[PDB]
Design an enzyme around this catalytic site. Structure first.
Site, short mmCIF file in Angstrom:
data_model
loop_
_atom_site.label_atom_id
_atom_site.label_comp_id
_atom_site.label_asym_id
_atom_site.label_seq_id
_atom_site.Cartn_x
_atom_site.Cartn_y
_atom_site.Cartn_z
CB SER A 214 -0.69 0.17 1.03
OG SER A 214 -2.53 1.04 0.92
CD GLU A 347 -5.10 -4.58 -4.29
OE1 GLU A 347 -3.81 -5.25 -3.98
OE2 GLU A 347 -5.38 -3.94 -3.01
CG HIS A 467 -5.24 -2.28 -0.21
ND1 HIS A 467 -4.50 -2.81 -0.95
CD2 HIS A 467 -5.21 -2.05 1.15
CE1 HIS A 467 -3.19 -1.66 -0.42
NE2 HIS A 467 -4.26 -0.97 0.05
B1 LIG Z 1 -2.95 2.17 1.67
O1 LIG Z 1 -1.67 2.42 2.91
C1 LIG Z 1 -4.05 2.26 1.90
C2 LIG Z 1 -4.32 2.30 0.48
C3 LIG Z 1 -5.55 2.89 0.03
C4 LIG Z 1 -6.44 3.66 1.61
C5 LIG Z 1 -7.97 4.45 1.42
C6 LIG Z 1 -5.48 3.56 2.78
O2 LIG Z 1 -6.39 3.71 3.85
C7 LIG Z 1 -5.65 3.46 5.37
C8 LIG Z 1 -6.77 4.26 6.30
C9 LIG Z 1 -7.49 4.89 6.23
C10 LIG Z 1 -9.00 5.44 7.11
C11 LIG Z 1 -7.56 5.94 8.35
C12 LIG Z 1 -6.53 5.46 8.41
C13 LIG Z 1 -6.14 4.84 7.09
C14 LIG Z 1 -4.81 3.16 2.63
#
Ligand SMILES: *B(O)c1ccc(C)c(OCc2ccccc2)c1
Length: 566
Positions: A214, A347, A467
């Protein structure tokens, strides 16, 4: 997050602390680093293995006070022996479970693990960069335990780096020395530490692999793009992300004023005055208000985070991103090291919890104009050209006459992951020495073994491979358990750590010694390929054409009249 899951988590936290104690041993050890001696300890795993652990190794000065928002500074060496038998705190962030701010500004540490401090051979070094959208994450073993990787004869290193506004504030005014990307500069400094010190732990400084999932994949890609890291490592693995994902960078220079004003700043929009206020704020106040920074318009246009990696407005000694990532690909040193990339088979299932609270998002698929790549879209997304582009997306993901929640999440798989991957591959092919890139597709589904992200995506009892679901088979976490050696989950652990260790060692992810891969012929992608091949990782390991190819080409077709921007 529910009270049930909150109390559930508190308990597992209490269980983690006791299990951590119980799996600690009295065998302490001292290693040399260029900044001084460090003391580590041997730890056990639930599979009755053991490894040497060094945690809380600083690779930079604590970025506090006048160093807040600034590029990291080399840490001060010490006489004597530094205690590294305990982890440090994580970067300041909102705990997704509790909803409260946790962590500390004093967070620039890494941890080093190996099953043997004096191996017969110099071992492959695997460097993990965690994700969490550049706003959450940690190297704590309650989420990223090395327990599975230390079954293999490698050295594994998990780094932290500054998150959120504290890591990615960016100000235009050159005099203030806040160009942005402090958090990426953290990573650069940690990699430099690793190159110069892994040998002290049994590591081979000439065989280093950087990998991440990610935002950690986007991070790995940035480390392959920037000149600051040229030649520091030798393989890269991008797990469900890269630097040209739309969520992976943003021009946030105007948002520092907004953050200040959210925190009670009284005065004018001036970079110097805004910085001075931000320098004195409580760090937990800034991080908690970060959620409110994006405008309704920015959210509509799918800007996911207010602060993240950015194109720095001017050059400095430690500058990491002088141009947009697409541009940096043209000259990137990392285009010429062995590379593996991949994504999970569903994902976008990751966005289940967000859809739940915002059901109206599904109606975005009526025209899909909000999902048209922002560089092609007009500001109001009302241009007939934008309606045409949106119709291409709609044709790719809307299966009935009315869009569904699964159409939305399927679309998300592509907008956020598969399409940026495609663009990257095609761009890179025009600027590479000819080093191989291999694709995988993680398609193993189980809920007998999970990781805490399942809680955050509300995916309990939910089918499909979201994901982050792959993390479960790479790292121990406090929700895990000992699995039977014959179970499909255990087999998948051995397969995933095996392939990742094989690739790290040789630059080729195929090995006959990995169960299930007997009839596998894993070829890399060639520029001439019209169709991508990938190793589909499921109960069986099978080479297939990427099922997502048709949809990928449909996204590409939006660029038919704007080929220079693809
Ligand atoms: B990868 O690091 C990643 C991809 C897409 C999203 C939306 C994402 O959000 C993580 C997150 C969402 C809400 C609160 C805190 C972290 C991470």
């Amino acid at each position: 997050v529910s009270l049930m899951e909150k109390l559930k988590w508190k308990i597992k936290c209490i269980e983690n602390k006791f299990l951590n104690y119980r799996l600690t041993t009295n065998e302490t050890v001292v290693a040399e680093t260029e900044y001084g001696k460090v003391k580590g300890v041997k730890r056990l795993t639930v599979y009755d293995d053991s490894y040497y652990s060094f945690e809380g190794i600083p690779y930079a000065q604590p970025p506090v006070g006048e160093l807040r928002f600034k590029a990291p500074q080399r840490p001060t060496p010490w006489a004597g022996v530094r205690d590294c038998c305990n982890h440090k705190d994580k970067s300041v962030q909102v705990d997704f479970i509790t909803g409260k701010v946790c962590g500390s500004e004093d967070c620039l540490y890494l941890s080093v693990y190996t099953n043997n401090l004096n191996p017969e051979t110099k071992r492959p070094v695997l460097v993990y960069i965690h994700g969490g959208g550049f706003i959450i994450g940690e190297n704590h073993r309650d989420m990223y335990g090395p327990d599975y990787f230390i079954k293999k004869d490698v050295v594994l290193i998990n780094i932290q780096y500054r998150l959120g506004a504290l890591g990615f504030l960016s100000l235009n005014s050159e005099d203030l020395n806040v160009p942005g990307n402090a958090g990426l500069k953290d990573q650069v400094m940690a990699l430099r530490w690793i190159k110069n010190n892994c040998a002290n732990f049994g590591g081979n400084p000439d065989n280093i692999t950087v990998f991440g999932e990610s935002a950690g994949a986007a991070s790995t890609h940035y480390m392959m793009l920037t000149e600051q890291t040229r030649g520091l490592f030798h393989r890269g693995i991008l797990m469900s992300g890269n630097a040209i994902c739309p969520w992976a960078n943003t021009q946030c220079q105007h948002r520092a004023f907004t953050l200040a004003k959210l925190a009670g700043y009284k005065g004018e929009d001036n970079d110097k005055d805004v910085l001075e206020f931000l320098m004195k704020a409580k760090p937990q106040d800034l991080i908690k208000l970060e959620e409110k920074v994006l405008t309704l318009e920015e959210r509509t246009n799918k800007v996911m985070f207010p602060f993240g990696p950015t194109v720095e407005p001017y050059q400095t000694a430690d500058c990491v991103l002088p141009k947009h990532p697409r541009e940096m690909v043209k000259t990137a040193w990392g285009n010429s090291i062995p590379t593996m990339m991949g994504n999970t088979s569903y994902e976008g299932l990751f966005f289940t919890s967000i859809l739940k609270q915002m059901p109206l998002l599904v109606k975005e698929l009526e025209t899909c104009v909000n999902f048209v790549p922002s560089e092609l879209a007009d500001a109001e997304r009302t241009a007939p050209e934008t309606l045409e582009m949106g119709a291409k997306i709609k044709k790719a993901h809307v299966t009935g006459e009315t869009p569904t929640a699964d159409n939305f999440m399927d679309l998300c798989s592509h907008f956020y992951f598969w399409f940026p991957m495609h663009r990257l591959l095609q761009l890179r092919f025009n600027h590479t020495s000819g080093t191989p890139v291999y694709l995988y597709r993680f398609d193993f589904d189980s809920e007998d073994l999970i990781n805490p992200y399942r809680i955050m995506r509300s995916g309990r009892g939910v089918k499909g491979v979201s994901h982050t679901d792959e993390l479960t088979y790479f790292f121990w976490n406090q929700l895990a358990k000992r699995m039977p050696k014959e179970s499909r989950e255990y087999k998948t652990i051995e397969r995933m750590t095996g392939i990742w260790t094989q690739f790290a060692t040789t630059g080729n992810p195929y090995s006959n010694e990995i169960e299930g891969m007997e009839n596998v012929s894993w070829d890399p992608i060639e520029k001439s390929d019209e169709v991508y091949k990938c190793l589909n990782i499921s109960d069986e390991l099978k080479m297939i054409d990427v099922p997502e190819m048709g949809k990928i080409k449909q996204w590409e077709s939006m660029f038919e009249k704007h080929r220079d921007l693809f």
